[PDB]
Amino acid sequence: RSLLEGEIPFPPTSILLLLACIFLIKILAASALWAAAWHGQKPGTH
Numbered sequence: 001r002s003l004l005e006g007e008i009p010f011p012p013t014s015i016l017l018l019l020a021c022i023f024l025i026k027i028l029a030a031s032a033l034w035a036a037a038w039h040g041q042k043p044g045t046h
Helices: 014-039
Strands: none
Touching: none
16 A cells, blocks of 8 residues: 555646756766866876
8 A cells, every 4th residue: 555656746747857957967077077077187298
């Protein structure tokens, strides 16, 4: 008896997913650039 799993989500939803995406890429990107620069910006060793 777990009716909580058989209920449909309210028809609104998709816009919420878009908000998640903006949060996601914003983190994964900013952290990465901050790292490589913090060691050396534009490293040489060509």
